[PDB]
Design a binder for this molecule. Structure first.
Ligand SMILES: Cc1cc2nc3c(=O)[nH]c(=O)nc-3n(C[C@H](O)[C@H](O)[C@H](O)COP(=O)(O)OP(=O)(O)OC[C@H]3O[C@@H](n4cnc5c(N)ncnc54)[C@H](O)[C@@H]3O)c2cc1C
Ligand SMILES: NC(=O)c1ccc[n+]([C@@H]2O[C@H](COP(=O)([O-])OP(=O)(O)OC[C@H]3O[C@@H](n4cnc5c(N)ncnc54)[C@H](O)[C@@H]3O)[C@@H](O)[C@H]2O)c1
Length: 355
C-alpha cells in the first residue's frame, strides 16, 4: 500500500496532491522547497521518505500554500502561476522523483535562510533568529535539530543546532501559526571554535543554509505523562525549551515539570530570569540551578551531576505516575547521568538522552 501523487490546474493555480495513505499526517510531515521553475517535497511516511522532485513547466510565484486532509493523509500544495495560461504537463521529473526510501538512507537537503536578528543572552550565548524563504515550508518537530551550513575559504562547514522557541513567556512567545517562517536558536560562541566564530561574524541580512530536521525524539513519549524531569547542562538546555513549552500547554495530565540546570557560573545561566518568572507564575514547574564553579557568593547548589544530586531530585513519590526524564549536555554529563538513572531504577522507555 504505497504512497502516490497527482496534480491539476486552474486558470492561475497548480495543485500537487500527495496521497500518503497514512493516518497521523500533519504539517510536520512534509517539507516543501521550490524555485521559479522547480519543486521538491519530502514527506515522512513511517520510517520511509517519499520524494516528489519536479521541474515545473512554467514559472510560479514565491508564495504557496500547504494543506493536509488528516482523515486520508492527503497533502495538497497550491502553487501560483506567474502567467495565467494552460500547462501541457506538470514538468520533467528530477533526481529521485517519486522515490520511497528509508530515512536511514537519506541525505541532508538544505535551503538558504536569512539572519533577521541576534540578541545576547549571556556573555557568550546569542539568540539567533532566521527566516525561511517564502518559497519553503518547513516545521522542526519538538526534540529535533537541523544542521546549519556556512561557507569558508575552500569549503563549507556544518554543525547541528536545536531550534528553540522565541521565548518561554507567553507575552513574548509566537502564537500557534499555520506556518512559522521564523526559526530560533540559542548558540554558544566558542572563541577557539571553527563554526561559531564564523556564525558570530555573519551580518544581519546575510544567509545561512539550513538542513531538514533530524532526530528520533517521538513526541508520543508525552501521551498521558504526569511527571516530567529535565536534566540540562550548558547548551543542553536548548532541546528542553520546546519540551518545556509543550509540557505546560499540551499535556493536561501533567502534574509537575522539574528542571535541574547545570552551569559553571551565574553568568552562564541561559534565560535565568525567564525561567524564574515562569516558575513563579506556574506552580507546576520547579527550577533548580547547580553551579560547578561559581564566581560570586552562591547560596545555591554546587557541583556536577552526582548520585547524591539525582537521589533527592528524582526522589520517588508516594503515588505511582507516568514519568519521563530527558537529559542533554556534554557527553560525560549525559553518559554519567544515564548510568545513574539506570541505577535509580528508571527504564529505557522512561529516559530520553539527546546526543
Ligand atoms: C544534535 C546536536 C544538537 C546541538 N544543538 C546545539 C544548540 O542548540 N546550541 C549550541 O550552542 N550547540 C549545539 N550543539 C553543539 C554544536 O553543534 C557545536 O558542536 C558547537 O557549536 C561548537 O562548534 P564549533 O565549531 O564552534 O566549536 P569546535 O571547533 O567544535 O570546538 C570548540 C571548542 O570546544 C572544545 N572541544 C571541541 N571538541 C571537543 C572534544 N571532542 N572534547 C573536548 N573538548 C572539545 C575545544 O576547546 C574547542 O576549541 C549541538 C550538537 C549536537 C550533536
Ligand atoms: N541534541 C544534542 O545532542 C545537544 C543539544 C544541545 C547541546 N548539546 C551539547 O551540550 C554541550 C554543552 O556544552 P557547554 O559548553 O554548554 O557546557 P559548559 O562547558 O558550560 O558546562 C556546563 C555544565 O556541564 C557540566 N559538565 C561539564 N563537564 C562535565 C564533566 N566532565 N562531567 C560532568 N559534568 C560536566 C557542568 O556541571 C557544567 O557546569 C555541548 O557539548 C553540546 O554539543 C547537545
Amino acid at each position: 500500500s504505497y504512497p502516490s501523487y497527482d496534480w491539476f490546474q486552474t486558470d492561475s493555480l497548480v495543485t500537487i496532491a500527495i496521497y500518503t495513505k497514512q493516518k497521523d499526517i500533519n504539517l510536520d510531515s512534509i517539507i516543501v522547497d521550490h524555485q521559479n521553475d522547480s519543486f521538491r517535497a519530502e514527506t515522512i511516511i513511517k520510517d520511509c521518505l517519499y520524494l516528489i522532485h519536479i521541474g515545473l513547466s512554467h514559472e510560479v510565484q514565491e508564495d504557496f500554500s500547504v494543506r493536509v486532509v488528516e482523515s486520508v493523509g492527503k497533502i495538497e500544495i497550491v502553487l501560483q502561476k506567474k502567467e495565467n495560461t494552460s500547462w501541457d504537463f506538470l514538468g520533467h521529473p528530477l533526481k529521485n522523483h517519486n522515490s520511497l526510501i528509508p530515512r536511514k538512507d537519506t541525505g541532508l537537503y538544505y535551503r538558504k535562510c536569512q539572519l533577521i536578528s541576534k540578541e545576547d543572552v549571556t556573555h557568550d550565548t546569542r539568540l539567533f533568529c532566521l527566516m525561511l524563504p517564502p518559497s519553503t515550508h518547513l516545521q522542526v518537530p519538538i526534540g529535533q535539530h537541523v544542521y546549519l551550513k556556512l561557507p569558508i575559504t575552500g569549503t563549507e562547514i556544518v554543525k547541528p543546532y536545536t531550534p528553540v522557541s522565541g521565548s518561554l513567556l507567553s507575552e513574548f512567545k509566537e502564537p500557534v501559526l499555520p506556518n512559522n517562517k521564523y526559526i530560533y536558536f540559542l548558540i554558544k560562541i566558542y572563541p577557539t571554535g571553527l563554526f561559531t566564530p564564523e556564525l558570530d561574524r555573519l551580518q544581519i541580512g546575510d544567509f545561512v543554509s539550513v538542513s531538514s530536521p533530524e532526530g528520533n525524539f517521538k513526541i508520543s513519549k508525552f501521551q498521558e505523562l504526569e511527571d516530567l524531569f529535565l536534566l540540562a547542562a550548558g547548551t543542553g538546555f536548548t532541546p528542553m525549551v520546546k519540551i518545556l513549552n509543550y509540557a505546560l500547554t499540551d499535556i493536561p495530565s501533567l502534574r509537575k515539570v522539574k528542571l535541574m540546570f547545570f552551569n559553571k557560573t551565574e553568568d552562564d545561566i541561559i534565560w535565568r530570569s525567564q525561567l524564574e518568572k515562569l516558575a513563579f507564575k506556574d506552580k507546576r514547574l520547579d527550577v533548580e540551578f547547580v553551579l560547578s564553579a561559581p564566581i560570586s557568593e552562591w547560596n545555591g547548589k554546587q557541583g556536577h551531576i552526582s548520585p547524591a544530586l539525582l537521589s533527592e531530585f528524582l526522589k520517588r513519590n508516594l503515588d505511582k505516575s507516568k514519568v519521563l526524564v530527558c537529559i542533554c549536555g556534554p557527553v560525560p554529563f549525559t553518559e554519567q547521568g544515564v548510568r545513574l538513572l539506570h541505577d535509580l531504577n528508571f527504564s529505557k522507555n522512561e529516559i530520553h538522552s539527546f546526543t
